[PDB]
Amino acid sequence: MISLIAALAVDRVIGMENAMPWNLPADLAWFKRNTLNKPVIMGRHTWESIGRPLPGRKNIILSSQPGTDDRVTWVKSVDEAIAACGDVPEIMVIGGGRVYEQFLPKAQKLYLTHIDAEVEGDTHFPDYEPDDWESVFSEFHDADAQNSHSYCFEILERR
Ligand SMILES: NC(=O)c1ccc[n+]([C@@H]2O[C@H](COP(=O)([O-])OP(=O)(O)OC[C@H]3O[C@@H](n4cnc5c(N)ncnc54)[C@H](OP(=O)(O)O)[C@@H]3O)[C@@H](O)[C@H]2O)c1
Ligand SMILES: Nc1nc(=O)c2nc(CNc3ccc(C(=O)N[C@@H](CCC(=O)O)C(=O)O)cc3)cnc2[nH]1
Ligand SMILES: [Mn+2]
Numbered sequence: 001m002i003s004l005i006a007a008l009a010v011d012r013v014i015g016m017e018n019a020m021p022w023n024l025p026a027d028l029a030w031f032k033r034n035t036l037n038k039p040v041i042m043g044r045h046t047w048e049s050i051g052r053p054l055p056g057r058k059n060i061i062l063s064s065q066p067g068t069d070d071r072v073t074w075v076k077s078v079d080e081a082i083a084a085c086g087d088v089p090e091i092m093v094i095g096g097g098r099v100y101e102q103f104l105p106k107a108q109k110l111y112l113t114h115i116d117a118e119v120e121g122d123t124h125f126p127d128y129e130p131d132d133w134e135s136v137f138s139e140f141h142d143a144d145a146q147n148s149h150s151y152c153f154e155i156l157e158r159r
């Protein structure tokens with residue numbers, strides 16, 4: 001099973017200048033809980049944005065060019081990325097925009113954080129078709145001293 005996990009600001013913005021400009025510790029904790037002990041697939045730009053391997057996960061990087069770091073696994077196509085995960089119950093696709101576009105048609109589950117924040121961005125989560133997806137979990141949180149915007153955790157499953 002393939003799942004996508006992402007945090008979206010208003011208008012599906014996910015990034016600007018190869019960064020995420022907000023800081024929401026509760027959402028990063030949600031990301032860690034839902035990805036730990038699973039393989040994570042990311043594109044090369046997202047690898048550069050994170051800047052180091054994510055511990056406790058098999059890190060798989062898509063790039064058309066040879067890898068430059070043997071602490072992670074480098075692959076050259078979507079099918080190779082999936083194969084490199086092996087026989088696991090759930091593969092997590094962690095972006096960015098170009099990678100989400102390619103994996104969305106193959107995904108059964110979306111883990112989305114909707115952040116109440118207006119962000120100028122240059123990268124968006126794919127337009128997906130709402131009729132294709134059922135919301136099976138949602139949890140709203142007001143802003144607090146640690147998290148400066150309200151946010152909603154949602155899990156959707158392909159109908
Ligand atoms: N809010 C969130 O949830 C979230 C999550 C992830 C990322 N982001 C943000 O998203 C942005 C990065 O997204 P992006 O769309 O620019 O880039 P990306 O999807 O991270 O990376 C694209 C790169 O991945 C490689 N690639 C993708 N598909 C491939 C394929 N089928 N075969 C081989 N290589 C492939 C290519 O690398 P080569 O050029 O080396 O061939 C391509 O240039 C950043 O702003 C980041 O902060 C946000
Ligand atoms: N919901 C969501 N939020 C994100 O921030 C996110 N980020 C990415 C890609 N970028 C990043 C950037 C940093 C870390 C990171 O530092 N993660 C630590 C945080 C642990 C914690 O804060 O408790 C990790 O071990 O996962 C992960 C992904 C992909 N999907 C996402 N999905
Ligand atoms: Mn092929």
Ligand SMILES: [Mn+2]
Nearest residue numbers: 083086087088
């Ligand atoms: Mn197999």
Ligand SMILES: [Mn+2]
Nearest residue numbers: 116117149150
């Ligand atoms: Mn806000």
